[PDB]
Amino acid sequence: DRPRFSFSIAAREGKARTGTIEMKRGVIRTPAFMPVGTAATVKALKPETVRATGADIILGNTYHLMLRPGAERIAKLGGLHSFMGWDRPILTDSGGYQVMSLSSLTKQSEEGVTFKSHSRHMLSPERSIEIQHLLGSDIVMAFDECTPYPATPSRAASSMERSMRWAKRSRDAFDSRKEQAENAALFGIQQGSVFENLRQQSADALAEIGFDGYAVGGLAVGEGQDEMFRVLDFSVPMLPDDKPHYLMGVGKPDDIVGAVERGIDMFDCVLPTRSGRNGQAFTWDGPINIRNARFSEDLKPLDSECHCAVCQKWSRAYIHHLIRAGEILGAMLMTEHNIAFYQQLMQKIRDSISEGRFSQFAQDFRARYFA
Amino acid sequence: DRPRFSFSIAAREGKARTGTIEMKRGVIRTPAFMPVGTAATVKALKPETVRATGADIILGNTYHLMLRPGAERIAKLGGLHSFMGWDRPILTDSGGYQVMSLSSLTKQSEEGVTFKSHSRHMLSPERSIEIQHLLGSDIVMAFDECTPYPATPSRAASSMERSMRWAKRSRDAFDSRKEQAENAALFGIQQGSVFENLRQQSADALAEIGFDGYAVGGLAVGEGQDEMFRVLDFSVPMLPDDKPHYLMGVGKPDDIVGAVERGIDMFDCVLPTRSGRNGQAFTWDGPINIRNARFSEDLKPLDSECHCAVCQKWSRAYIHHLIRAGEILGAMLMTEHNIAFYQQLMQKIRDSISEGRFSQFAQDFRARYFA
Numbered sequence A, B: 001d002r003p004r005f006s007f008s009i010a011a012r013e014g015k016a017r018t019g020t021i022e023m024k025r026g027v028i029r030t031p032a033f034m035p036v037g038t039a040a041t042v043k044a045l046k047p048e049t050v051r052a053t054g055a056d057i058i059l060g061n062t063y064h065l066m067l068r069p070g071a072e073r074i075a076k077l078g079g080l081h082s083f084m085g086w087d088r089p090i091l092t093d094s095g096g097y098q099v100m101s102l103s104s105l106t107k108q109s110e111e112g113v114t115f116k117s118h119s120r121h122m123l124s125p126e127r128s129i130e131i132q133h134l135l136g137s138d139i140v141m142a143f144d145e146c147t148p149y150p151a152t153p154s155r156a157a158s159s160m161e162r163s164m165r166w167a168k169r170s171r172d173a174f175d176s177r178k179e180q181a182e183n184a185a186l187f188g189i190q191q192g193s194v195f196e197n198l199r200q201q202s203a204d205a206l207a208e209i210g211f212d213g214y215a216v217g218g219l220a221v222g223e224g225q226d227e228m229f230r231v232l233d234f235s236v237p238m239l240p241d242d243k244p245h246y247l248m249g250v251g252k253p254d255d256i257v258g259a260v261e262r263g264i265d266m267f268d269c270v271l272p273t274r275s276g277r278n279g280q281a282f283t284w285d286g287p288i289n290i291r292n293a294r295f296s297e298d299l300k301p302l303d304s305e306c307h308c309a310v311c312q313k314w315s316r317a318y319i320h321h322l323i324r325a326g327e328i329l330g331a332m333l334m335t336e337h338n339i340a341f342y343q344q345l346m347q348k349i350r351d352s353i354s355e356g357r358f359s360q361f362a363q364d365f366r367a368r369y370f371a
């Protein structure tokens, strides 16, 4: 039987790594992309379709699930895996980001965050870890605070310091719960905004506590790709080399490629699902908006090389019609293609690192995608 | 290779019949239920899922398709079958009903109907048959007028007489187009409101023209089940026994059972798809509204006996959550179950007629469904 958690690196090229995370519910190939399963569904896809695209693990939103249908209710029904019909690993976020971005009103303190639903509710390190346990999460995220951008050095420091205190509370809550500690993994989240010294203090604090994996938090919050890459340049080397590195909320295909070049192993983002429902399809020649009139009689598939079931059967012209008409099948087909495209990107990244040709792949990818 | 059209009756019980329609694109088992594929999609289902539920044929809406994406455009793209990815028979309606129920403004005359889109457009017997040809329909419906209910005898007669003149024009238009006449079938539509003498005149006119199948039009327009059954009692025996009998726009499960008892072979209705998206699931114990709070923690499948993929995997509690949350997957799962339920109903009808026990099946079905 598989271990609780084992990360093995099979090949490296510069800062990039490829390998596997073994967990009780399955193997995760890295670098990995996690489709987002917001409120117990990857929007518009059956779980079998999510798996057919190549996904090894999905993300669940703790903030949404604790509000509807409720964490205790999901536990009573047998846990999130049984409830939604996904039997492979699930990573749950902590709620610390979505509570601040989606709640109508919030009250922040050293204890946690009190908030009104968009009903009064509470999130703290202890309650977040408990909710993730009730959901039956395989990878549990420490409860943190995503510092707004831009941030002054003083405010970034105060925020990061609170997050590190919350990281220790998250560790202790996770470890106190025997079944969770034995069957799940816990990741810590680095903060510190764009400041190298704060990023280093945060990395040091997280390594002293000790986690199964380490996320670079506080990015993709408005700073732009150049600045995100500059922060990753110094931030990723601060994290333990032998554990996974997770960049949450990222991103566009070129964001992912450049982040892998900087040592990131795991990603999640709503872009392929949400923008798919809006009509944006990803292709190796860049994104297209299928709503555009130029696609009304285009018999080609969404992408000329994509191996997904959508590109094997249906034309741009048909999908154009469905999206223009507001048809559910349009959202279904766009989403399946986009998630499959993201998985094919991850597969090409993994294969190119394994073969020592990732630098060339990244150059060729960018030249064609931006042509 | 299969013929253009062959209807064979394999077994009978009273007025009920079971058998097959053979056409170039496939075999249709009768009595048959046709899922409705409005604007080139059975809403929320891939065609492969429609087929997996047991459907042999689907219906397409001529009124919607001529407006978006357009009939000429669909023909340029290779026809409706290729466009939407359904390679089995498609029956198209004529537009004569939806033009009057959905258009913002209409002008009726002996030539046809001029209307404004909900852009000015025209429908006549000749244009309707042409549009159905451009779509590549396998079963073409004559262009008719569905008399409003209630109707005075005078107005029902005048309306029926116009429909019979339009039926002859539809026949001649279909026959003039060699490729259509050789590869598709044409059905005529009986009118006459609730009046036996008008129903007989209409049946006589349609049989004199000659069609491949005969529909009972003008019902399910507000008259109620008792009156619909009373009209079917005398109307179906007026139609040629050796051709299929089609009751369009019907209906609830008990409507279908009683209509088969009266000699109907084919049905279509938006009820399973549209009401599925709204939260109504059909079960052998009657319909349920999955939104109801009583299902929030119910781990049973939608129906205890249903063989569909939804009932094999997901609980009422999960589907309750999805529909309450407005999630696309909720519409997908409800629709697949409801269409599968309708197909299982048709299969039980066909098997019970084949075995000479349909009368008992109808009694047992109604006793449990209405308990």
Ligand SMILES: C=CCOC(=O)Nc1nc2cc3[nH]c(NC)nc3cc2c(=O)[nH]1
Pocket (backbone or CB within 6 Å): A092, A093, A094, A095, A096, A097, A098, A141, A142, A143, A144, A145, A146, A147, A189, A216, A217, A218, A219, A220, A221, A248, A249, A250, A268
């Ligand atoms: C999902 C993983 C677990 O994350 C947490 O528990 N907290 C957390 N979530 C984030 C989410 C982000 N999305 C973006 N941009 C779209 N930037 C983000 C930054 C953070 C962050 O600093 N912390």
Ligand SMILES: C=CCOC(=O)Nc1nc2cc3[nH]c(NC)nc3cc2c(=O)[nH]1
Pocket (backbone or CB within 6 Å): B092, B093, B094, B095, B096, B097, B098, B141, B142, B143, B144, B145, B146, B147, B189, B216, B217, B218, B219, B220, B221, B248, B249, B250, B268
């Ligand atoms: C679809 C088959 C082809 O039908 C036509 O070309 N015309 C036609 N459509 C109808 C549709 C109906 N729906 C209901 N109730 C929901 N009653 C209906 C009656 C008619 C009718 O009399 N004619």
Ligand SMILES: [Zn+2]
Pocket (backbone or CB within 6 Å): A302, A303, A306, A307, A308, A309, A310, A311, A312, A337, A338, A340, A341
């Ligand atoms: Zn594709």
Ligand SMILES: [Zn+2]
Pocket (backbone or CB within 6 Å): B302, B303, B306, B307, B308, B309, B310, B311, B312, B337, B338, B340, B341
């Ligand atoms: Zn079912």
